[PDB]
Amino acid sequence: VKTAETGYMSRRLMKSLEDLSCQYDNTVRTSANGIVQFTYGGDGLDPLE
């Protein structure tokens, strides 16, 4: 039951969060260029770094 709900969870969080990206404006925008975040995380920093 753990194998199903692991894949099912990020597969539905994907369908809302596919087309969000960090722009050269430093904002995070959608497909239709509507602002989600003026800067990512409030500091602009990258969790992998």
Partner: protein, 243 residues
């Protein structure tokens, strides 16, 4: 990855890479895709490459690091009472290098009865083999099982069981090499510090040296599990049926 063409009928990844696939060698299979265009071949090796993906994006923590049996053979070298002479040391340094990489032998840890090198001087040559190597790391870390020192004034590395690793100038002055400093969870790993200071290749080279040594060492040192490991002593057997 980069393909390598070998005579059997099976895919052979390295064992430090089987942690992101969350796989083991028990009969499961994988899927190899060969890209076909120059743009799709260059995006795959640069963005999806192993050396660039040595950290998970979830937290920026190492995910490709030492697996289960490369932590054991590494602990058994840098254990406090491993002492090597020139014949054993330079053979052990040739295991990790394939007889190609050049080494500058430090003066030994012990001089007057014999000439002996601790096992912590061997891993300090796995990080930087000679003076031409650029990797000079300075980290400071607690192991998994950390027995603290006797008094609380002795700082951290005066610990019992030798459980606080301090590396100064890419050389190991204390502490064993374990999951805490070679595994896949901590931002004070040895491999993490080589990546964050010197780049993805130098962290990959030091990991390939540790994979080759610990795959030749441990079959010539010997490590094994028996029934006397699991058997309780007869003063546990009396004290169990009291509690």
């Amino acid at each position: 990855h980069y393909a390598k063409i070998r005579p059997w009928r099976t895919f052979r990844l390295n064992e430090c890479v089987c942690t992101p696939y969350n796989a083991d060698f028990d009969g499961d299979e994988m899927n190899l895709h060969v890209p076909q265009t120059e743009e799709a071949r260059a995006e795959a090796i640069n963005l999806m490459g192993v050396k660039n993906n040595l950290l998970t994006p979830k937290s920026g923590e190492p995910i490709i690091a030492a697996t289960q049996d490369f932590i054991t053979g590494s602990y058994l070298i840098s254990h406090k009472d491993s002492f090597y002479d020139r014949a054993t040391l330079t053979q052990l340094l040739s295991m990790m290098s394939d007889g190609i990489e050049h080494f500058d032998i430090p003066p030994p840890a012990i001089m007057k009865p014999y000439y002996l090198w601790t096992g912590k001087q061997v891993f300090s040559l796995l990080i930087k083999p000679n003076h031409n190597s650029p990797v000079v790391i300075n980290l400071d870390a607690k192991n998994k099982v950390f027995v603290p020192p006797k008094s609380k004034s002795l700082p951290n590395e005066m610990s019992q069981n030798d459980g606080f690793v301090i590396i100064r100038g890419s050389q190991i002055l204390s502490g064993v090499m374990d999951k805490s400093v070679l595994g896949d969870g901590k931002k004070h790993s040895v491999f993490y510090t080589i990546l964050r200071d010197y780049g993805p290749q130098e962290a990959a080279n030091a990991m390939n040296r540790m994979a080759k040594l610990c795959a030749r060492f441990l079959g010539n040192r010997g490590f094994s599990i028996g029934i006397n490991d699991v058997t309780p002593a007869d003063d546990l057997k009396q004290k169990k049926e009291e509690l």
